[PDB]
Structure formats: C-alpha cells, structure tokens
Amino acid sequence: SAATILKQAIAGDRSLVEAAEAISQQTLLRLACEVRQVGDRQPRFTATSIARVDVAPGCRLRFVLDGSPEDAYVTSEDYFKRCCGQSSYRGFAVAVLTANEDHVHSLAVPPLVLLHRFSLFNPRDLLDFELACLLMYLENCPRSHATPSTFAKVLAWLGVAGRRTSPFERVRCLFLRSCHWVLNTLMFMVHVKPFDDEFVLPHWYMARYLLANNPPPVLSALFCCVAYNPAGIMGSCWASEEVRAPLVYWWLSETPKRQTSSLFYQFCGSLEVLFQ
Amino acid sequence: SAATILKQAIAGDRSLVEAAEAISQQTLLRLACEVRQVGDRQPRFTATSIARVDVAPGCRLRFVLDGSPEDAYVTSEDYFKRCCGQSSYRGFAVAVLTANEDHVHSLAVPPLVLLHRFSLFNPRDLLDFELACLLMYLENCPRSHATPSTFAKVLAWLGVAGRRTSPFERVRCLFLRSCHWVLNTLMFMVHVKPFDDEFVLPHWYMARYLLANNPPPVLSALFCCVAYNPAGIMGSCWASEEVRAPLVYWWLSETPKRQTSSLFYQFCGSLEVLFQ
Amino acid sequence: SAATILKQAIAGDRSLVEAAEAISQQTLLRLACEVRQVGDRQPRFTATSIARVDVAPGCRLRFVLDGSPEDAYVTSEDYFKRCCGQSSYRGFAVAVLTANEDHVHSLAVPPLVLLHRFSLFNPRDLLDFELACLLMYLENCPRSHATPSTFAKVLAWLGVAGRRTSPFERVRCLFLRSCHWVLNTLMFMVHVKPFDDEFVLPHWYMARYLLANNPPPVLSALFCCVAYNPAGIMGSCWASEEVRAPLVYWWLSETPKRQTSSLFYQFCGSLEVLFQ
Amino acid sequence: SAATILKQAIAGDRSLVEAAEAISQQTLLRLACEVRQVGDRQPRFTATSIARVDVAPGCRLRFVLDGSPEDAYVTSEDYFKRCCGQSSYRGFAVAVLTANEDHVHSLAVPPLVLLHRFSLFNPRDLLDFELACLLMYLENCPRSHATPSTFAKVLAWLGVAGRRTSPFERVRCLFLRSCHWVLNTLMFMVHVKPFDDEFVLPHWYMARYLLANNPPPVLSALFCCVAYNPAGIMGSCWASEEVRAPLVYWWLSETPKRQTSSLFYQFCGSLEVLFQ
Amino acid sequence: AAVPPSEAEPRLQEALVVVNALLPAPITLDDALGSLDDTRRLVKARALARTYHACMVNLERLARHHTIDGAVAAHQDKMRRLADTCMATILQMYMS
Amino acid sequence: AAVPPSEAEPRLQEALVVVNALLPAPITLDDALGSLDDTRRLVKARALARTYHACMVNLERLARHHTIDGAVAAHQDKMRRLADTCMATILQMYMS
Amino acid sequence: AAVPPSEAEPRLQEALVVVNALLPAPITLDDALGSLDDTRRLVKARALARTYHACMVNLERLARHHTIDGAVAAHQDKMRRLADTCMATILQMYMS
Amino acid sequence: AAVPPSEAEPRLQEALVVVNALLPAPITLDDALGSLDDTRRLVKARALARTYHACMVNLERLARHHTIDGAVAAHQDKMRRLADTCMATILQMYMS
Ligand SMILES: [Cl-]
Ligand SMILES: [Cl-]
Ligand SMILES: [Cl-]
Ligand SMILES: [Cl-]
C-alpha cells in the first residue's frame, strides 16, 4: 500500500502530504446523535434536537431546539452547559465510514461490521460540541431549511472553525470534513450548485440522477428508541434496520466503548537507540 | 530470529519477501463454523451448513445448503444477505494454527492454549463470506463430493479470487492459503495427485501411509452444540473433546473476543523525528 | 506539532530536552485522595487524613494524622505499613490535568471528559507514598499551616527527593512537579513570595487579584462520601459537583482502572531490521 | 536509562548483548502454583503437587506426586496429559519479580502492587510444563530432598533444557533462570556450595548469616485455599498474608488475566517509510 | 562470539519522536485507498448518470408535447435504447 | 520481479531501543502545547490583573479617606474607567 | 550540560510510515519458524512413510498369493524387519 | 508551501522488522537496573554478613569452652563490639 501512495503522489505530482490528505479525506463520521440513558434503563438516541442553526455577530453558533418557538434561539454555550449538567446525557454516538460506503438508503457495511464503527464522543470544549451539533443538524436538515442563506452561514462558520484548526487536531478535522461532505451533498440534492463538488458523496451524485422519477427496480437495488428527522434529506441511512439495530446493540454491550477523541493513535516521547 | 530469516534467505537464494512468505505460509485457519446465539441462551456451532459448492458462469460461488434438495442452489450473495438478516447469526468462529500443529485426529495445541487461538469473523463483503464458506465446506467435504470435477472448480475459483487479492490484504490471503492447505490435503487423502504437494498438511502426508490399514497402536498414538460432518475427510480434528470444549468455553467467556479481521496489526501514519 | 517544538527550541535557544521539559511541566496531578471500600459497599474518598507534615533529622517525612493529638507524629513508613495492611485501602485516586485547566473554583474539563482523567495509584515504595501524601496535604492545607516554616521544610524535602529522582522516573517527576505547582500557588494565595513564580497556577494568579473583594459577576464567572478540607486553600476545585460526581462514577464503573504508575508508556527491547 | 546501559557496557567491557542479559537476569518468577476451580466455586492454589523429582535415562523428567507412595513415579508427559484432561485445571499462577524484591520471609512489593505481578501460564508443550513443575518443586523442596544427588540431577536436566533453548524464547529463558535462582539459593541455605554463587538470591545470602541463631529483632525486621509446603526451604514468602491475599484477589478481580506466554511484547512485520 | 566495547565501541542516538495515525480507527489504509479508487471511478461515472438523466428528460418532453405517423415512437425508441446502454454500463461498474 | 540475495545481499541491523512517553496518558501533545501557550498569555496578563488591583486599592483609599467639590468624584471616575478597561481586556482574552 | 540549538542546531525528519504484522495474532515468529522447520523435516520423512507403505503392500501381496518350504516366511521376515526399521526412525523424529 | 515530487522525488524504504521486549511485563527498565544495583551492593555486603557470622561463632566458642579473671569477658566484649559495628553498617545500607 505504501508503493500505491508513492505511485499516486508521482502520477498526480502531489506532495506526500497532499497524497496522504486525499486518502484521509475519504473518511467521515455519520449517524451523529445524542445519547441519553437513565441508569441501566432503555437508552435514547436523538438526532432531531436542533431544528435550526444561525451564526451570531462574533461568528458563534446559536440554535433553535426541537419543540421550542421558531425564533427562540439558545447559544451553543448554553446548550453545551445544559447537556453537561444532565445526568442522563452520555455524549454523541457517531459511526466512522469511508465515502464509498454511504449508499444513500443503506450503508455498504454489514450490521456486525457496523457494530465496530461506532464511537462515543464527549466534547472536550465548545468548538467540539458545535461541530457534533452541526453534523447532526446537517444530516437531519429538511427541504425548508436547505436554503442558499443557510448554506452561506454554515460555510462561513466552517471557514472560521477551519482557520482555528491545525491538521494535527485529527478529530476536529474529521468532524470538519464530515460537515463539508454532508453540506455539499445536501446542496446537490436540493439542485443547488455545491461549494465544492469534490465533497458531494459519490453514490449520492449517482442516486440523484438514477432515482429522480419512477426508477426501475434494478436501479433502486443499487441503493436500497432512535429519533431522526424522517424529512431529513441527508438522513435516509437512518431508515435501515441494518443501521439502527447495530447502534442499539453497540450501546447495550458491556464491552468498553471506543472514544471518538481517541480514534487517531498518537505517541510523543523519547527514542534511544544503542548499537555496536 | 531475524538472523534465522537472513540465513534462510541467503541459503535458499530467496529474496526477503520470499523468505517471509515461506514463514507466513505455515499459518492457516481451521475449525471454520457459523455461530448462532439467541440472546444469552445455548450457542450453536455449525460446520455442516454447506452440503455442495458450484461455480457460476461469471465465476461466482453458489451453494446447496444442508437439508435442501440435491440440485437446489442458492447464490453466495443470497446466503450472505440471509445470514446478515438473522438476529441470532454472530459470524464465523475460526482457530489459527501453524501447519505442524494439525495432527489429523488431534491438534498439538493444549485445550487452554487453543482457547486463545479462536477469533470471530464478521465478513466485510461477499468475497470474505465466500472464503469462510469455502473453507468450512472443504473441511467437512465427504468422499462423495471429493472428486476431480469439484477440485478443478475450487482451484479455478481460488485462482480468480487470488488475482483480485494483494499480499497486503493479510486476512483474505490467510483464508485463501487455508483453502489451498485443506484442498490439497483432501485430494491427497482420496489418492488424487494434489495440485501442489507443498500444500498437503505434513502430518496428514505421514498419516495416510502410517494409518492405511490396521495400524499398530504405536503409530496411531502419533495422531490420536457443535455440528460437523462425521464423514468429513478433513474434519477429523472436530471429534476431539480437547477441540470442542475450548470452542464452547471461548464463546461463553465474558472477556471480549478477537476479531479475525484484526489478526494482523497495522499502523499507518506520520513519523516525526527531532534530534540535535 | 514537532515543527512547533523545533520552532520553540530555536526561538528560546533551549535544547530539545529543555523544550520537551517546558511542555511536560504543564502537566500535573490534582484531587489526590485515599480510596477505601469495604467489599462492594459505598466507597470513601479522603483527602483530610494528614493534618500536619514535618521533616525528620535524616530528611524523612513525619505526619500528624487527622484526629490525633497536635504533636503526635507517625513516621511516613508506619503510615505506609498501616495503609498496606488495611483490607479496605485501595490506594490514591488522582486526576491528570494541564495547568490551564485549573480554573480555581472549577476545572475547565467537562464531567464526562474528567471521568477519563482519573487513575488509581498504588505506591511502589515509601518515596511514592510520601509524594502522594504530600500532594494531598498541600491541596488541603488550611491558612494556619500555610506558614514560611512549613514552606521551607516542604521545599527542602522536595529538593532531597528531586536529587534522588531521574527524569526517566516519569511518575515520580509528575508527583514532584505537582507538589511544586500546589506549594508555590499556596504561598502566592497567602500573599507570601513564591519560591518560583513560574509554578503559580496561571488562573490562580489572575483570581487572587480579580476576586479579592466583592468581585463583579462577570469576573466571578471566569472561575465559577468525598471528604476534603473546606478550609483547604488549594482544594477549592473539590467544591464542584462536576468534579466529585465524575470521581464517584469513575470508581463505581466496571471498566478496569488506569494505574497511575502506568501513565507513561515505556518500551525497552531489541530492534532488528532486515533489508535488501 | 539507555545512557546507564552504555556506561555499564563500557565500564565492564561487556557487549550490549551481555549488558542487556545482566539486566534481564535480575527478573524471575516466584510463587509457582497450580490453579484449580470448579465453575465459579472457591478456587484452589496448590504448590505441593510434586513431592519428588527424578531424571529418566533419556533425560526426561519424572515425578512422585503428593499423597502417592514414596517410589510411585509418573512421567512428566503422563502428568501433563492428566492436567490437560482436568476441566477444573486452569494452569499455573506465577508472580514476576526482580531479585532485590525477594526478602526471604516477605516480598518488598506492596500487596496492591503484587496484584499486578501475577500471570496465568498455560504450558504450550511438555518442556514448558516441566519447567513450571520444576520451579514449583524447587520452591517447596524440604531439607530431606535438598541433597547433592537431587542438585546434580536438576542441574544436568537444566543444562539439557538450556541447550534446547535459544535466547529469543523469552518465556522458556525466564522459567530456566528462575530455576537457577531457586536451585542455587536452596543449595546455599542447606550449607552446600552453590553451582553458581551469582544465582544465590541477594537477601537470602544475607539472611542465612544474619538470622542463623537467636537473631536480634532489628535484623529480623529486615526480612519479616493456598496449599504450600510449610517445610519448603525456598517457599517462606508464602507464609505472608500480604502474598496470599493478593493471589486470591487477583484470581477473582483481574478481568483479562495476563498470560505468562505473552509477558514479552513481540512484533514481526514489514516497515515501509515514505519521505521527500 | 560477543564483540566487547573495547573492540567495537557502542553508539547511543537520541531523539524526540512524534507519531500520529493518518486514519480514524478501525479504518485501514486498504479501506481508504479502496474508497479513493471507488470515488474516482464514480466521479468518472457522473457522465453516465448525466446522460441517463438527459434521456429521461427527453422521454418526458416527448410524452408531454404529444396513428400511422411513427416519428414520436422512433424518437422514444432512440432515447430508451441510449438510457438502457447507460444503465447497463452503470450496473456493470456496481455489480462487478 | 524479486531480487535474490546473490544479486542484492540483505543487511541485518540490530540495536537495543528505549522508548518513553513524554506526557501522562490521556494528555496529548496538542493539550500540553495549548496549555503552554495559554500559560504564556496568562503570565503576560498578570500586568492587567495587577493594574485592576491597583485601581481597586485606589478606590478603597478614596472611599475611606472621604457637595459642590467634585474632586473625589473625578478621581473615582478615573479609577473606575481604568479598572473597566483592564476588566474588558482580561474578558476578551478569556472569552475569545 | 545541555547544548543549545545555537551551538548544535536541531534537525527535524518527517515520513509517512506503514507497518504490517507478518503473522496472524497470537502466532509468534518462533512458532512459524518452528513449523517451517518441522514441515521441512516431515517433507524429508515422506521417504520413510512411503518405504513403510511399500513393505506393507509387499506383506499383503505375500499373504494373498499364498510346510517345510520356508521361502514365503523368509520374504515376510525381510519385509517385517524393514517396516520395523522405518517405523523406529519415524518414531525417533516424532518422539525426540 | 508543498514541494511536488517533480522537484523533490519521494523515496520509499522497506524492511522486515523484529521487535522483542527485553523484560517481562510489568517490570520496567528502571526496576531491573535498580535491582542490578541493589544486588551488586548486596554482593559487596556479603563480607559484612560473613564477619558478623564469625563474631557470633567466636561468641559461641567462648561461651561453650568456659571470677576475678576478666580474660573471657574481655574477648566477649571485643566480639560483641565488632558484631555491633557489622550490624550498624548493614542496617545503614538497608535503611537508607
Ligand atoms: Cl483533535
Ligand atoms: Cl484483508
Ligand atoms: Cl517513576
Ligand atoms: Cl518462549
């Protein structure tokens, strides 16, 4: 596989940093949801918590929560404090995928394999919380809110968040590119020119054309306690029982959970080499 | 041990890649079986699920399942979907061994050591599922199906599967060579010239001659909820209680299980070295 | 991040050893307490066990335990033996932080993140036990014992302990610098010139001035079974429920606990490299 | 610490291999015992199983088991098969130490630290089983069997076992040197010249002289379901409750028990390095 | 066999090392390279999905704007055949 | 494709290696570098906390030691404004 | 004792690294090398198993095709002794 | 800022690596070096334990083989003082 990276770097005249970035850019997080559980009772997976997103004058995120009046915004900071103060709140569940695995109405990941793709995210600060909140919002965003104004505000905020983030902050970068994949695919699905067509999920690009109107079964066949928005344009993978049953089974398992903040192995230390 | 590899590479005039391949080729998977468990009830280990194997015109595997009519084939894809859709289905259990450990009617691995050789395989795609299915079939194949026609079809399919696989796909390679060991030993045991006599399990080569007819006890002594084919030529290791009790005990243990897809440690990442 | 170390080493003309030490010096242990649990009953976390500390002629630590007469000292060795002989004694719980996270009346670490910062310390020898005892004493030390005499004795003992310690004894070094952070901050909080003002916790330096008398809410907002000294000058982080509930929840969890003595990964062994 | 190895290699004019061997030779296994447990009932730790040891004409070990007639020997192979066939048999428990930690009537390892020194050994073959049996025998050997004849037979067998073993068989080497430490210390304790006085445990060398007859308390103070031989010369560490309670607690609390065969981390594989 | 330091002096080299995984666990390098290859093939396949869509729009235009006159039917047959060809090529790429 | 040893002889290099983490788990290099940066900014900010404290002491001195005479009120206004300026700068650093 | 960068400038080297285990866990290099050695000895031992088999076929031929005539008994003794020799050599290799 | 391969061609180096821990887990290099140092100090201290033992044997010989004659008492005092000196030195090494 290193010989493949070398061949790709030379063939495209891309530095090794650029060649590695093209490979890592194929990964994203999907199925973002808040986990709530009272003791050992039945857990709840909610992806509908944020109904609307807006950007404050000082480029800070503000939200309209599910069930709240249309123009009753809460700062992302106040929502972060409220969640941290809830004893039932366990963080966000997310599934790690490669772009080729998202097949629009299904995931090309068998349910027993998907079990091993989930991780639990406990936001370390406000920016982490905002990124998880934004990913979840974008995946569940209905047609009514998928507008040029929303797209412009989201991109501007992602631009500011991106400038604050270094490529060595691997988890923040993962959430940031996941937002870019979901955002650009959402724009494409509502027949709006994406900001970056390289960030339209590849099977979604095909599905918009192939499933447009009364598709033949042969084309539809290529694509096929959990609260998600049924009108969410980017959330159609949630409909699959082969997606929801592994999420619940992953949660219920007594085996310790992988932490999203630990997805990227790191070592920093001294190396001493002794030889004759 | 690295000095041993160096000595072997020079002595045989084999490149380091060839010397390493000769060492890794000594490893194989055995005791392939499907695991089914309803909640926390008694588990079931089935190695008899596939009664017959045939290759389709487009070199895809098709199976006659146990209990189904003689010529009632199911595609490997339909059997993969059926298993993925079964809530009781847990994947395949396999035991990792070196070729010198398979002693025909026993394994030269103490039961408490064998406990640590099992891993659970959750096929990542169709090819993975077909490989596990084929290994399990070959181990349980009776005399009636151990024919030149079956041998030719199996080799042709393995050839196509092999060309699709790179040596960096460690797990696929492991299942592929396991099929070659079981296939060539099976051919040898039915007195048919193997395709590759280097792939006849070494103790099986000795046992066919030494245990041919009314062997003396001194020669027999060298070799000695689980459904397996009692008429399976390559499945004689299954008869041993020192093989079946560790499989069941391994499954019931509350300690997390090793995933077959994780048998080969991998790291890919950046290395930065700072020195004065 | 290695390019950042290189830039810092050059810009400050600090060797790589000095540049790495400046980075590692930002880490410390806080919330030191003794853990006692009789079987599976309610655990007890005690940070008040040591009322007074004194240095013996041969520079060995002596303690006046809580509830004992004012001048009734026990040797650190006798207290180590007593704890080792108590069946309910489980060692010391400590939380690992960076200096920027200690916000005086709170920790800038969300409760679900703090859960992953605790480790259990089982002193390997007397010096280890003395260091954990001293850290806990300093964090809970009231105004009455925060005197120049106590400061001089503590610094002299830390100097002797420091000379006995190598920078490769990572855990001992961690406890030693944690004592220096808590000691120098304590001196600063009682309006006594610290021995090293670089070891005054940075938010504590700000809080002493900003919260001096009737602070405005806007300034107070920047800072906000468990027995701790409520009169302990350096123990104000203990008052927060977002500190104590994670400690108890971390303890009660069935997931195996991280050992403080294992915080720093180590490998020592042979490396053989074979190539053509 | 690598600078220490370099200084030691140069100062003693010892190769790096010799310098590393002197360091690793300080480690040994102690407290060897067989573990038996019927389901989840009370476990049994037995170090008394082998009453006598003898070497067969073909230099194979034979044993007189506890409770069997004085001259009723069983081959090591027959005892290995009997143990492998017992469903209650769990293998051998052993504690890893450095030579300076064995203080004759106590171990200089606190009970909560000792908990983390135990590992479970499941002999991989006959030689592994014989080594564990021999270590356990030597630790529990009474005065009556600590004779020149026994010493000669044990050394001759260890010599043959040593010639069969390479230094990269880390676990076999660990059991072999543990036998040499226990054997040479045993000879010294019965006032017989050891084969190698460098293999007399250092605190035992001091204790034989200092505790010879009516020792003063000040000298005695330097040294202080489990079946062990109370007349076992090398087994005096077993008398301590600070040794036995951690063994039992480790058996009932340590969820993923460390395997003695995995004590020495190993990696073998390909390394690819890409750079500009 | 051992060469003493007096004959071959040992060397000690020291460094600070920083190691970071490229990909989030449990994603392997093979997984991400396979995804990059699939994505590049699917980006090329956009031409086929666009062509299929143009055929389907032409079929809708023919049905909305409109016997012994076979002209409309001849146009519909041409669009149906080209869409079938696009569909066949897409299916071959998906079902390899 | 393989090059045999007879054409390109393999080399074997051996060493003793010692590896030690710089930081206690789960603290990352980014966490400790971020802390070093925050600490350096907060060490510089000590000047602001000291200046605010000076204003507050001056306000206490003015209130303790003491109408158509606006002198004391003019001094109090100056100290209140400078303390507000220090407070605003500290808040901007904390709430970025 | 520390050498500042101004006297010995630090160097930073960067690479992308790919590491892959050769063998499936928990199989060790010693296990696989021991298996390769056993297999090579057992491949050589095929000659002994084949010779033993030839003796046994000759014994069957002698018993099927057939006293003061000791010819058959003399042939059977020769085949029994050679098979015993083969058997003894195989047992020595297995039971070392 | 990125340098393309056309300006600085990448290099790929490949090797087979074998890594083995020197010590059994959880024993650290510091633990084993500390043990080697303690053992070397205790091997030197054998002289003190042997001297103490000689004083104790001399005391037994004096008591077994035997007033205004203080000769035996003078010998016992000398042996008791030397044993005390040995004991004091051993205790200082143990209780540092
Ligand atoms: Cl990050
Ligand atoms: Cl693979
Ligand atoms: Cl340490
Ligand atoms: Cl070994």
Residue numbers in the entry:
A (entry chain E), B (entry chain F), C (entry chain G), D (entry chain H): 11 to 234, 253 to 304
E (entry chain A), F (entry chain C), G (entry chain B), H (entry chain D): 24 to 89, 96 to 125
Provide text from the study.
The pUL7:pUL51(8–142) complex was crystallized and its structure was solved by four-wavelength anomalous dispersion analysis of a mercury acetate derivative. The structure of native pUL7:pUL51(8–142) was refined to 1.83 Å resolution with residuals R = 0.195, Rfree = 0.220 and excellent stereochemistry, 99% of residues occupying the most favored region of the Ramachandran plot (Supplementary file 1–Table S2). Strikingly, the molecules of pUL7 and pUL51 in the structure were arranged as a hetero-octamer, with single β-strands from each pUL7 and pUL51 molecule in the asymmetric unit forming a central β-barrel. We therefore suspected that this hetero-octameric pUL7:pUL51 arrangement was an artefact of crystallization. Taken together, these results suggest that pUL7 and pUL51 residues 41–142 assemble to form a heterodimeric ‘core’ complex and that recruitment of the additional pUL51 molecule in the native heterotrimeric complex is mediated by the N-terminal region (residues 8–40) of pUL51. Structure-based searches of the Protein Data Bank did not reveal any other domains with a similar fold, which we will henceforth refer to as the Conserved UL7(Seven) Tegument Assembly/Release Domain (CUSTARD) fold. pUL51 comprises a hydrophobic loop region followed by a helix-turn-helix.
HSV-1 tegument proteins pUL7 and pUL51 promote virus assembly by stimulating the cytoplasmic wrapping of nascent virions. pUL7 and pUL51 form a complex that co-localizes with Golgi markers both during infection and when co-transfected into cells, palmitoylation of residue Cys9 being required for pUL51 membrane association. We characterized the pUL7:pUL51 complex by solution scattering and solved the atomic-resolution structure of the proteolysis-resistant core of this complex using X-ray crystallography. pUL7 comprises a single globular domain that binds one molecule of pUL51 via a hydrophobic surface, a second molecule of pUL51 being recruited to the solution complex via the N-terminal region of pUL51. While the fold of pUL7 is not similar to any known structure, the α-helical pUL51 protein shares unanticipated structural similarity to components of the ESCRT-III membrane-remodeling machinery. Given the conservation of the pUL7:pUL51 interaction, the conserved localization of this complex to trans-Golgi membranes, and the established evidence supporting roles for pUL7 or pUL51 homologues in virus assembly, we propose that pUL7 and pUL51 form a complex that is conserved across herpesviruses and functions to promote virus assembly by stimulating cytoplasmic envelopment of nascent virions.
